[PDB]
Every structure is written in structure tokens, then in C-alpha cells.
Design a protein around this ligand. Structure first.
Ligand SMILES: NC(=O)c1ccc[n+]([C@@H]2O[C@H](COP(=O)([O-])OP(=O)(O)OC[C@H]3O[C@@H](n4cnc5c(N)ncnc54)[C@H](O)[C@@H]3O)[C@@H](O)[C@H]2O)c1
Ligand SMILES: NC(=O)c1ccc[n+]([C@@H]2O[C@H](COP(=O)([O-])OP(=O)(O)OC[C@H]3O[C@@H](n4cnc5c(N)ncnc54)[C@H](O)[C@@H]3O)[C@@H](O)[C@H]2O)c1
Ligand SMILES: NC(=O)c1ccc[n+]([C@@H]2O[C@H](COP(=O)([O-])OP(=O)(O)OC[C@H]3O[C@@H](n4cnc5c(N)ncnc54)[C@H](O)[C@@H]3O)[C@@H](O)[C@H]2O)c1
Ligand SMILES: NC(=O)c1ccc[n+]([C@@H]2O[C@H](COP(=O)([O-])OP(=O)(O)OC[C@H]3O[C@@H](n4cnc5c(N)ncnc54)[C@H](O)[C@@H]3O)[C@@H](O)[C@H]2O)c1
Ligand SMILES: O=C(O)c1cccc(-c2nnn[nH]2)c1
Ligand SMILES: O=C(O)c1cccc(-c2nnn[nH]2)c1
Ligand SMILES: O=C(O)c1cccc(-c2nnn[nH]2)c1
Ligand SMILES: [Ca+2]
Ligand SMILES: [Ca+2]
Ligand SMILES: [Ca+2]
Ligand SMILES: [Ca+2]
Lengths: 409, 410, 412, 410
């Protein structure tokens, strides 16, 4: 997370020839905030936490980023996550900068009313630092749409009804349709555009998918409905194989009945540790980072790797897979459908008028497609891989937004 | 009035949802009640003092919305019920507002046009800090009109900058929306179409008797007529006209515009207005007054559908009698919501800085009335209740879950 | 209470006639600037919901920010609450402090609520009205059912919305900007007003005997302040008993006796008395400091005092007023006599507005200046209108609010 | 050093108060910590980027107060300890402030005066929403001065209007207070009068040795001299001068102003500066550095009183040794508080829109220092502790009382 973002920035920065003093400024966050969050517990005794918000950059618009309720709050990693938000939003051309915040706590130690009091106190402590056009939080580790409802409710006492102050809200409070499928569907839209470069379609390819959660389930469904052959799916408990393509609609039925993959009758049970070296045209890691390293890299038999999980390829595998002719669609772009639909929720709220799910998906496609074209165009200016096309694209957009605004007081 | 009807429907819907009684109490208590002194100098230099008010009932689902009445009758419980009714109505058609109701206890016909302007501006000065484009958005009502709203807009904007969305019902020249005059009558016809689609039928299959021929009745009849429905009977306060082959509503409208009276229309036969509700037809549409259907005449109703365009036309006796006769009643809280819906669209257009054409207003109105009927119908399935309770439980449940999601900690 | 409604109405109508108030101006002065009711819902300590209605009547602000208490009390009759807010508008005008009147509260019984429920309720109430109050808009204060701890919570909650705002509320703890001199303010103000009254006759407090009904916050300090000025306190009663001494009670010793949980009847430096004879006791000066409605037609003819200082609110009903008047009894009216408390409350606001607290000698020096100036104005008014002291005070305050209103004007 | 001394004194005072451990955790966590990018163009057109910061420790007793340091070393733990020490110090002399501390990691010698102005204004733009007359009131510190404050005032006022009280230490021409230069040294002498009055003694009864002759030492020496005290020894970084009759401080000041060195003054005998702390006197006043009294020289101190004007001059080893010899030590947290106290008076005068003359400033400074000593001594009686713990328990408890009164519910 930390180490990948640092290296990718340094690689992209040298490709762009970034001015060293501009680079220094871009690395310094706009603002770092730490606040006391003290609440009474349900039994009346006090507990005290520190909440935080790193606001990295706002050259391209309000800041955007999750709120983590999690006990590990290493400042360098939180800073890297906020920077990564700044580059990711710039890659897909949404008008935001990057931020990241949270509270150093373990939510599983706290009752639902304690979580509410903690969230409202946190909002009271930062209400003057966020805002619909200033900094727009979202769920992350340890928070969810109920958390956002509390932030919305508390913030609105200080500034009036502000549905756009936060994304990831319950539908009943201005949340957007289409959020659940956003990332998985965005993966497939990105893949459509990539394959369009070869005049090929998803229906021409076979797919192996590692991980079968929110990203994995929706990606498989969208691939299956577009004629792709999902020939292998794994998750943490097992794996299933079918050289003629698994009936993914039927597989999802089985999963919903609390069944395990290997027990599916429309395929052959498989060892999950064989999923990455499986023979297929396209590999899509949707589980964990660091699954591709120097060890297994030569044994990957896929022609395309769609990085849906964050950082599944360490630099060792990247170099190895590159020379073999493997094309890797990078994580900062490939899984960006979620943050993109989060932008649409914000847009729908500032417009006072919600979109239907078909409009959400039409705009998601338009944004993911125009983003791939811009990445590919950058790869053609700098003669670099797709990962560097994306990072130079985002880094340059932040840089020239920063330069246009200027430096005088 | 509207108070007995609203309290009864709230209590029935509350029992069906199994609403927690302490949540129920909170939903009944208005967010805020305001009364302000409104004193103006008259044209002749003397002083007069009135009391203005704004009941802000609920804002769990969004900014409050509601009319301003210039009227001498300011009973607090009735005004509370009207504000409460707004909260449920906006929830029924899924527009992101809560309910409010305000006004000034005065008789507008005792005031000259300049006295009315000074009064409107003073009221705005006294409440400007309590309203706003995302807080509470007033609209016309009894005794006020689009000119009143222009004055509120102009005075409010001195305190907060140009804010066309602070009020709806504006003149077209100041950000008012197209499609407002037809909104309610057309919304009734969209609602009636969606109901008939449940039976695979069309408006063109039906005959219609319409009580009332004002802003709602004229536009409802026009929209029915242009869709091939047969409007066989129309009444208003002075008479009624009948034609079993369908009245030519286009000609009836020209007649009304030419200062004509219903019973003098030659393309039909004069009728006793008291025969309207018991007339032989498929669809009855009260568009005039409340309380017209009671235990006396309910058993004499000969229609299969009743589309409630006026507010509270069926008292509980008739609702009972009509149900076990197989009569299907589309409830007023939903059927006439086209007006409040286009009022929302005007706000949306102002918020978006860009007006819609009338085709777009009516396409969205249709989408909103249709999606609302489907949601009502789905509720009927889950709760095994009629359309009136499907609608009230839908709106009440939406307000309750917005409230529960927002929470209670300080 | 109910007596405050009837008394405030009668006094307003009487003063309005003496002044010849224009009836449309009078109609406007009776209509409050603003009436607010808000939902106040909180979780109880057990997690269940409870819902109350809070309210704030903002009667008048022609002369400055509104000022008035917050009552946590179950009886919230609109006409009475309205009368109380209006009474504050007249009271602040009588002593020339730059406030209008307001009155607010929550319909609840505080004894039913734990300290943590009361805090949550207070903060929610503040969240619901923070935009309607303010240091130069409306400044609440303690009242029935609230105290300085309640004010600390309002201050803490209000300041989240507007920054640290110590002047938004008076009656605060000393630790949070409260003023010195609050405890003695009303009783000490009573004695200052009495000094000014007796000066008209070339007499001083050391010349008089005093009978005092009630021995709480007002009665103890008034008796103490009289005693230190050489007045002879010959009778004191409270709800449980009474003590008399025609030579004067050693009030310093009486106060020590009370502080040790002693009863007035059991005091050794006097003779026990029937409390029902306190008002007809043989003295120069009678000071009701307990309850309203104590002087009526039954007993007015038997009052032996030549001066009665109304420290409690409305202790004399209209029947006794007429009877005492024709007997030559001079009545210093409650609206003025007990105004020391609200005056030091203004001083707290002033100290917070100035960012710099006064010492107690300064507070009291100013309290005396304000009560003495106020008496001179009341007396001057009695000269021009040829009326008793009660109407001197009401016409003074009513006229000041009227003139502030007329100067501000009526055009939008 | 401020981190280990402040932590040791807090923990000791907390154990004396029986402070609840969960309250103590809250009191140690700062209200808010801010870091902001401060980038400016240099005079030559190139860019430079610094990090500005503001630690806002506590505001239970009032707006935050604290200096702004332009200095390259910005250790977070040291800056937190300084902001927290401010919170206790303001509570000890009972001024209505909490503690804060901020600055910019830069070397002001590397920057021209116009670059320093732009940097100050950029810093102000980045934090204007976090400071304010009733929120957080900065002041000069290392590397900043009254010209820096004028720039902050000037830039802040573009965002919130003319706000003279947003910063203290301003030039006299822009709302600064009279009496600010002498404030600390004069405050030291007021504190000493209050202490000596407990013994029925006066300053004129005592002999004084002063280490350091800067802004604190010169004014304390002057204020002692005008009260009949005998200043028998003075040192600074380059030398020392001695006179058991009492040095003519008026002449010594005039010598210093004429660019003279202590060892070259003729109205005394030149002395080794290393002998100042062991000089023969009743009262020793460290006004130079911390850590000058330790176990090595503590047994050799001949004074009966030590007035801590410098910060942390006595380590715990010497404090132990001196107390067992019967030495009374007036603690730094109180003794040197005249500077912060007059800074409060500047803020007061600004919010009152009307400046005081220097007579009134010094009169109020004396009243504040006198009442603070009385409160400290009362605390010593209550807890049976020395003056240092009398002062810290006083300040810590006042902050604890204010946060407990304010409460914890959301
Ligand atoms: N959901 C989003 O909006 C989003 C956006 C950007 C990136 N991502 C990335 O996508 C990845 C997955 O996100 P998600 O929401 O689908 O998570 P999820 O928890 O919904 O699903 C994770 C899936 O991976 C499987 N898995 C876990 N450990 C595994 C292991 N060791 N080997 C194989 N399979 C394993 C799980 O069983 C599950 O099927 C993460 O890297 C995340 O950072 C998600
Ligand atoms: N216009 C809207 O947007 C709207 C919205 C919701 C509800 N409503 C309800 O619709 C009803 C009518 O509204 P409108 O705007 O069309 O009013 P309107 O004044 O424009 O027309 C009322 C019509 O009813 C007739 N009428 C009056 N009394 C009658 C009686 N006793 N018997 C028969 N006819 C009678 C009048 O002559 C006229 O034809 C009212 O109940 C109103 O509350 C209107
Ligand atoms: N305290 C103030 O700041 C203040 C200010 C203005 C007016 N007042 C008025 O002063 C009166 C007393 O106020 P307080 O603060 O001293 O009250 P308190 O509760 O502190 O004391 C009231 C006293 O009256 C006594 N008492 C009660 N019933 C009695 C009876 N039937 N006969 C004799 N004594 C009786 C009580 O025992 C007690 O001694 C009230 O009318 C109040 O409205 C008080
Ligand atoms: N000035 C204030 O407002 C203020 C307020 C509170 C505390 N203090 C503390 O007072 C002390 C001095 O402050 P100041 O403003 O007078 O400083 P200053 O820089 O104006 O003067 C310091 C003096 O100490 C002398 N000195 C330096 N090192 C010395 C050494 N090793 N031996 C002997 N003398 C030495 C210098 O020569 C000079 O005379 C510091 O500890 C500071 O933290 C100052
Ligand atoms: O009168 C109200 O309370 C009110 C408030 C907002 C909109 C509408 C409306 N427009 N058309 N029909 N109703 C009415
Ligand atoms: O009750 C009020 O309305 C009110 C408001 C502010 C101050 C006081 C007060 N203090 N002492 N006596 N009265 C009363
Ligand atoms: O530097 C600080 O923390 C600070 C903040 C406000 C005032 C003072 C001050 N004035 N004189 N001595 N100290 C210092
Ligand atoms: Ca930066
Ligand atoms: Ca409610
Ligand atoms: Ca009025
Ligand atoms: Ca803290």
C-alpha cells in the first residue's frame, strides 16, 4: 500500500520530468487534522480516542475519501492512502482531491449507540473542516452507510441539510442506486475498452477470478452476461473449475444458499492455490494484494491480468509478466468504479434529483471508457506500460491544476 | 376537517405498521412551531398588526415544504394537521421533503395590493432565518399566489442573496416551472392509468363522472378526453351536464372559457348536480369538495373505481360500504399529488440553474406518479390492505425509517 | 403562576391608561416578537426514547437583547408563560437595563430525570434554539427547575455552533464566567431600594423596625443587610415557625443558628411567634419575602406597618392595595424592589462582554447606583402622573419600551 | 527542558489531586492538532515549501492562547508539552484562556523581510478558520515579533473583518498594550512581594542575586531597585558584577543600553559568572536558563529564597536538596506569569475598544499576581505541599473543574 504508492509516484514523476519543488509541494498534504473524540460508554464511563483527517490535495476539487474505524493508524500509511485517492480520482477525471480519515478504535468493542455517539462527536470536531465543496467523506474499514447517516445528521445541525456532505448514504437518505455493482461492473467496462484495442470482445475470452466477494461476484456476473467464459473461480475456502465455462448465474444461486464453491455441481472442485497459474486468457485477482510475486510469475499462463484488488502484483512479478507479453490493467484504474459512482451520488445530491440505475450505469461506462482512452493515449506519448500511463495521467492532471491556480498569496 | 381525516388515517396506518408508540409520539410532534408579529403601515398611514406563523412538522427526509395561507382562520390543530399531512404526502410520492404549513391571520380582501406587498415582506423579514432552499421552501396557498411568492423571493434574497429555490409557485419570469397549471389534473390521469394497467385496461375503456370543474377537474377531464375516455357527466357548484355518449370536453372547455355555465352546454343534457355521485359510470372522480361521499349515498354509488382528486371526499362510513361492494378507491393523498410533485421539479430546476421544457416536466411527472403507484401496490401486497392504507403506510414507514437511520443520540 | 398573569395584566392596563398609550402601539407591545416551540427528544439512561416540547417566548427587544429564565417545569400554560416574558420586558425597563423580555423552558419534571438525562435534554434544547438566542439576541438564565449547572451545559453546547460565548447565558458557575455577588443581589438590592425610599423622608434604615416574612435567599440577605445598617429586625417568619424580639434580633447569630440546621422557633435570642401574626405585627416596615397573595381584604386593615417593601412577587392583591393606600401605607412595588437579581444578571453579561470580571465591591457599587437611579426615576414619574409608587414604576418602564419602539419605527 | 519537567509536574500534581484516571487521559489529549502546507514564492521567483502547525491543547477555561515559533526544530512531543504547559499556566493566574502552541518549521535568517511577510500571510490564510478572538489567540515567540503579529492581524482581518484581539504582542500603533516589556520582570517582583508579605517582610529588607540581564532580568532588577531592594550581584552570558552595598541599577541599565558589558561596569567588582548561583544573598533569581541548579551546586546555594523567573531552572535533585535546607522556591509556572497576564490585558483592551494607561495595566497586573499567590498558598495549606505543587494542583484542578462542569454528553 505505502510502498507501492511511493514507487509508482517516483516512477511516474521521473517519466513526467516533474519539477522538484512542485513535487515537494504535491507530497505535502494540504492539511493534517487530529482531534479528541471522547464519549460516555453505555455504562457512563468515559473512553477517549483520537480521530484524524489527512486532507492531501484539493487542486481539482473538494477532497474525497473514506473514514476508517480501525485500531492501526500509522501516519505514513494514512498519508499514502490520502495521496493515492488524489491520484486515483485524477486518473478517472472526477473533480476531487484525496483525503483519508478515521478514529483509532476497534468498532467491535463498541455498542451501536456508542458508535453513534463516537461518530457524532467526531463530526462535531471536524464539521468546520469538511463540507459539500470542501471534503466529502465515505465509508471504509469499520464504517458503513449507517455511519454516514450519523455524520449527515450531525453535520446538518451545523450547516443545514447537506446530503452531499458524505457519500455511501442509505438509499432512504440520498444514496445512489448502483453502488453495490459499481466496482465489479467497472472492472468489466474497463476490460471491454482494453479488449476493444485488439478488436476482440469479452465473448472471445476465458476468465479466472480469484476472490468471490462484492468485487468478484459482480465482475463474474457481468462477464457471464456478456458472453465471457468464467472457467475458474476461487475464494478463501475452495475453488471450482469448468473448461466450458461455469454457469455463473447458477453459481451465485448456490452461493446465496450459503454453499461453498468446491461443492458446486456445475464444475470440478479445484485447489485455490492453483488459481493464479490456471490456463485462461484473462486473470482477475479480486481478493488480496501481493498474490503475484517472483515465485509464481513465470507460471502465470494468462494473457491479460485485470487488477481489481489493490496491489496484487509486487514489482518482481510486474517485471517478469511484462517481458513475457502479459498486459496488466492496473488497480488505480481498474477498480475505480466504486469511487466513480460515489462521485455520481454527490452529483445527484447537489442536483437535488436522483438518477435511475440505468443512468448511473451509462455514466459509469462513459467515465471508465474515456479514462481508458486517456490512459492509452498517455502510454503512447511516454511509451510506457498501462500502469505508468495511468499514474502519469493522474499525476499530470493534479500538477497542471496546481500550476494553473498559481502560488502568490 | 382535514384534521379528523388525517388523524384517523395516521392511526390506522400506525396500527398496520406496528409503529412503536414512542417513535409515533415523536413523529407527531412538529420539529418547530413559529409565531411572529407582522405589523405594517397601511396606505393611509395607520398601523395594523397581524400574527404570522410557520409550523415546521418534519425534516427527516429533506427540506420542509408547504404553503402560506392568508386567511383569518388560524386554528392551531388544523394547521398542524395540514403540515403533518404534507410530511406523509411527500413521502408517498418519494419526493425528498418534509411537511410544513404557514400563514398570516388576516383577510387579504381588506388589504390593498401595496399593503399585501408590505405584509409579505415583513413576514419574510421575520422568518428569513427559519426558511431556506435546503431548510423550508414555501409555496402559494389560500389567499396567496405567484405574485406573493415573487415578493418573498425578492425580500429573502436581500438577506441571503438571489435564492430562486427558496420558494415555489413563482411567476414564469422569475424561475417558475412550466406545467404547473395542468399538474394535478394530469397527475390524476397518470395515477388512474397506472391503476388500470393492473387490470390490463386503458382509460379509453371507461366512462367517467367528474364532480367539480375547476383547476383539477378541467385538466383531468381534458387529459381523460384526449386519451379516449368517455366523460359522461360533469358538475360544478351551479349545475351539471350529462351525455351518455361522452361529452366533447374540448367544446365544454371553450364554453367555460366563453363565460358559459355547465347546464347551458348544448352538447349534453342538464342534470341535477346532486345526481353526479350516483350517476351510472365506471369511474367517479370527486374534484370539488371533501365529505361528499357518506353513509347516505355510498350504497347508491354505481361506479367500480373512485379516483379521489379532491381532499377527503370519502368519509369512513362510505370507505367501509364501498370496500365490501368491490369499489376500488385511489386515495387523495396519492392521486392529487401531481401538484406537489411539479412544485418539487420547480425547486430542482432552480437548484440546477436551468429550466426544463414542458415535455420534460410531464415525462418526469409521469415517471414519479407511476413509480409511486407501484410502491403503493407493493405495500398493499405485504400488508393485505386497500390502496388508501398502502399509501399511508408507505409514506409513514418512509418517514419512520429516515428518522431511525438518523438516530437519537445528542 | 396564575397570580402573575392577573397582576401583570391589571398593572399593564392601569399604566397604559395613565400614559394614554395609543391602542395600536399597545396592541403591538402585547404581541410577542416571536414564539418558538421545538421538539426535544432524548434517549433515557435505559436507552428508551422520551419526547418533550421546549419553548421560548421572545416578547420584546426594542431596548436590547432579550433576557429571561428557562423553566424545567410541567405547567406551560401559554398565557402565563407569555405574561412572564412580558413582565421581564417591563422589569428591565424599570431599572434601565438594556434588555427586552423573554421566557422559555421545557415541559418536564426534572426530578424524573437523572443528571445525565438532564444534560442530554439541555444540549438538545440548545441545539434546537441556538440560532434564536445569542449574546446580543436573547440571553437565557436559570429559573424554576434549572441552575448554574444547566447554564454550563447551554454554554458548552452553544459554543460548538458559534465559538466560546460566555455572555450567551447568565447565572453561570464562577468557574465559567459567573459573576461575584449573585447570592446577595436580590436581598441587597431590596435594602438599597429601601434606603432610597427612606431618604425621601430624611430617614435611614437605622431609624426603623422591620418584620420579615420568609427567610430564604431573599429574606436572609435582606435581614443581614438591614442588620448591618442598624435596622432593628423585630420579627422573622418562615414556613415552619417565627421568632420575635422587640429589641431587635441578632441577625448574625440567627444566621449561624439557621446554618446549623436550626429552626426559627428554637432560636434563643427571641420569643417564638405564631407565623400567622407576622403580617399584622407591630413594626414600621413589613417585608414579604416568601409568597404571593399574602395581603388581601381579610388582613389589610390590621397591618400596622407604615412601609411595606414587596420583595416577593405580587404579595398584595388589589383589594389590600386600595385599603393600605387610604391608610397612608407606602408600598414599594415588587417590579422594582426585587430587581437586584436581574440587575446583577445584566452585570454578569457586561463582565463577559468586556472579557474581564469585576470584584464584588464593584458589582455592589454598581448595583446600588442602578437601584438608586431607578428609584429617583420612579419618584420623578410619580410627580408628573400623581400616582402611587407601583404605577410610577410601571409607567416608567412601559413608557421606555414605548419610546424605544416609536424611535425604531414601523416601515420595513 | 519543557517535556520532562512538565510531565513530571503534571503527574505529581495529579497524584495529589486524586485525579480520576479517565479524566486525566482526556486532559492529556490535545483538543486539536493542525499541520498545513505553507508555500511561498521567494523574492527571486523560486518556490519554497514549509509546514505550519498549531497545537490547540485545551479550551475548557476559554479561548486558546499561545506563541508562534519560526524555528527549524519542531519536535511534536516538545510542542505538545509547551501547549499543555500554557493550559496550566493560564489556570494558575486565573486568566480565561487555555493553552496552544504553533509555528512554522523554517529558519527566519534564510528569508528576506518580504519573504517573511508572505509566509506569515500564507500561514494565516491556512489557519484563519482555526483561530479567532474567542477561539485561539496567537502571540510572538522564538523567531517572531510584533511585526509578525501585525501581518497576522492584517491578513486575518480580510477574512473576518478588523479583529485587533485575534493576536497579542501587536505594535502599540495597531492596538498593543502599554507595559508589555516590563510585564514579566515586574510580575516577578509582584510575586515576590506577596511571598515576602507572608513573613511580614518587604523587598527592601532583602539582598538579591540575579542570573541573566535580558528582558526579564533588567526589569526585575529595576523593579527591585525602585522598591529599596539591594541587587548585590548580576550575571549574564559574558560576565558578572558584584556589589554587597547594592548595585545602582539605574546606572547599570544605562551602561547596558550604551552597549556595555557587566564586567566593565565601574560601580562594582567584576565577578566570575560561574559564582553567581553560590553568591551570598537572601534571594536568588535565575533569569537566564533552565537546569542551572542541580545536585552539584544545590548544597552550595546560600539564598533562603529562589524566585524561578527563567523556565525550569531547578532539576528535581536540587529541588529536593534545597527544600531540605529550608529553602523556599517560588515556582516558574507562577513567578514568570506576568508576561502572559499582560497579554490577556492586551486582548481585554482590544475587545473593550479602549486602551488602558500603563498605571492601570500595572495595577491590574499586581492584583492578578497577588491573588494568584494567595490561591497558591491556600492550596499549599489544603494539600500540605510546597509552592510548586500548590501552583500545579491549583492550575490542574481549575481545568479539571471547568471540563467537569462542561460535561461529556454529545
Ligand atoms: N469493493 C470496492 O468498492 C473496492 C474498490 C477498490 C478496490 N477494491 C479491492 O478489491 C478487493 C476485494 O474487495 P471486495 O469488496 O470484493 O472484498 P470482499 O470481502 O467482499 O470479498 C473478498 C473475496 O476474496 C476472498 N478471499 C479472501 N482471502 C482470500 C485468499 N487468501 N485467497 C483467495 N481468496 C480470498 C473472500 O473469501 C471473498 O470471496 C480488495 O483488495 C479491495 O481493496 C474493492
Ligand atoms: N389544485 C391543486 O393543485 C390541488 C391539489 C390537491 C388537492 N386539491 C383539491 O382539489 C379540490 C378542488 O381543487 P381545485 O383547485 O380544482 O379548485 P377550484 O376552485 O379550481 O375548483 C373547484 C370546483 O368545484 C366546484 N364546486 C364547489 N363546490 C361544489 C359543490 N358543493 N358541489 C359541486 N361542485 C362544487 C366549483 O364550482 C369548481 O368547479 C379541493 O378539494 C382541493 O383541496 C387541489
Ligand atoms: N431569590 C431571588 O433571586 C428572587 C428574585 C426576585 C423575586 N423573588 C421572589 O422572592 C420570593 C422568595 O424567593 P427566595 O429566593 O427567597 O425563595 P426561597 O425558596 O429561597 O425562600 C422562601 C422562603 O419563604 C418561606 N415560606 C414559604 N412559605 C411560607 C409561608 N406560607 N409563610 C411564611 N414563610 C413562608 C420559606 O420557608 C423560605 O424561608 C418569591 O416570591 C420569589 O418570586 C426572589
Ligand atoms: N521574556 C519573557 O517574556 C519570558 C516569560 C516567561 C519566561 N521567560 C524565561 O525567562 C528566561 C529569560 O528570558 P528573557 O526574555 O529575559 O531572555 P533574553 O534572551 O532577553 O535574556 C537572557 C539573558 O540571560 C543571559 N544568559 C544566557 N545564557 C547564560 C548563561 N549560561 N549564564 C548566564 N547568563 C546567561 C543572557 O546573556 C541575557 O542576559 C528564559 O528561561 C525564558 O524562557 C521569559
Ligand atoms: O399548499 C401547500 O401546503 C403546498 C406546498 C408546496 C407545494 C404545494 C402544491 N402545489 N400544487 N399543489 N400543492 C402545496
Ligand atoms: O426569570 C427571568 O426571566 C430572569 C432572567 C435573567 C435573570 C433573572 C434574575 N436573576 N435574579 N432574579 N431574576 C431572571
Ligand atoms: O509563547 C507563548 O506560548 C505565549 C502566548 C501568549 C502570551 C505569551 C507571553 N507574553 N509574555 N510572556 N509570555 C506567551
Ligand atoms: Ca500540497
Ligand atoms: Ca417530530
Ligand atoms: Ca410586539
Ligand atoms: Ca483534552
Amino acid at each position: 500500500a505505502l510502498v507501492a504508492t511511493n514507487r509508482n509516484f517516483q516512477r511516474a514523476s521521473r517519466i513526467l520530468g516533474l519539477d522538484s519543488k512542485l513535487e515537494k509541494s504535491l507530497l505535502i498534504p494540504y492539511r493534517e487534522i487530529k482531534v479528541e473524540c471522547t464519549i460516555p460508554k453505555d455504562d457512563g464511563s468515559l473512553v477517549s480516542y483520537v480521530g484524524f483527517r489527512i486532507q492531501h490535495d484539493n487542486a481539482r476539487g473538494p477532497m474525497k475519501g473514506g473514514i476508517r474505524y480501525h485500531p492501526e493508524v500509522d501516519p505514513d500509511e494514512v498519508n499514502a492512502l490520502a495521496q493515492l485517492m488524489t491520484w486515483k480520482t485524477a486518473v478517472v477525471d472526477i473533480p476531487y482531491g484525496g483525503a483519508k480519515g478515521g478514529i483509532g478504535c476497534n468498532p467491535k468493542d463498541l455498542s451501536i449507540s456508542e458508535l453513534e455517539r463516537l461518530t457524532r462527536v467526531f463530526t462535531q470536531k471536524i464539521h468546520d473542516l469538511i463540507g459539500i465543496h470542501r471534503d466529502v467523506p465515505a465509508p471504509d474499514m469499520g464504517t458503513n452507510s449507517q455511519t454516514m447517516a450519523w455524520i449527515l445528521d450531525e453535520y446538518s445541525k451545523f450547516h443545514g441539510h447537506s446530503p452531499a456532505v458524505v457519500t455511501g448514504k442509505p438509499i432512504d437518505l440520498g444514496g445512489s442506486l448502483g453502488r453495490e455493482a459499481a466496482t465489479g461492473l467497472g472492472v468489466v467496462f474497463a476490460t471491454e475498452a482494453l479488449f476493444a484495442e485488439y478488436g476482440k470482445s469479452i465473448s472471445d475470452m476465458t476468465f479466472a477470478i480469484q476472490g468471490f466477494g462484492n468485487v468478484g461476484t459482480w465482475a463474474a456476473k457481468a462477464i457471464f452476461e456478456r458472453g465471457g467464459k468464467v472457467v475458474a473461480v476461487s475464494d478463501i475456502n475452495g475453488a471450482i473449475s469448468n473448461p466450458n465455462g461455469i454457469d455463473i448465474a447458477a453459481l451465485l444461486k448456490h452461493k446465496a444458499g450459503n454453499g461453498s464453491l468446491k461443492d458446486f455441481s456445475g464444475g470440478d472442485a479445484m485447489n485455490p492455490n492453483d488459481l493464479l497459474v490456471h490456463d485462461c486468457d484473462v486473470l482477475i485477482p479480486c481478493a488480496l494484494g501481493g498474490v503475484l510475486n517472483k515465485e509464481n510469475a513465470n507460471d502465470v499462463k494468462a494473457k491479460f491480468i485485470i487488477e481489481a484488488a489493490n496491489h496484487p502484483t509486487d514489482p518482481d512479478a510486474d517485471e517478469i509478466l511484462s517481458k513475457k507479453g502479459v498486459i496488466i490493467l492496473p488497480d488505480v484504474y481498474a477498480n475505480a468504479g466504486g469511487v466513480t459512482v460515489s462521485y455520481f451520488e454527490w452529483v445527484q445530491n447537489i442536483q437535488g434529483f436522483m438518477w435511475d440505475e440505468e443512468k448511473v450505469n451509462q455514466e459509469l461506462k462513459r467515465y471508465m471508457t474515456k479514462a481508458f482512452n486517456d490512459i492509452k493515449a498517455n502510454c503512447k506519448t511516454h511509451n510506457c506500460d498501462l500502469r505508468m500511463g495511468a499514474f502519469t495521467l493522474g499525476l499530470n492532471r493534479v500538477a497542471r491544476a496546481t500550476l494553473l491556480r498559481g502560488w502568490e498569496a
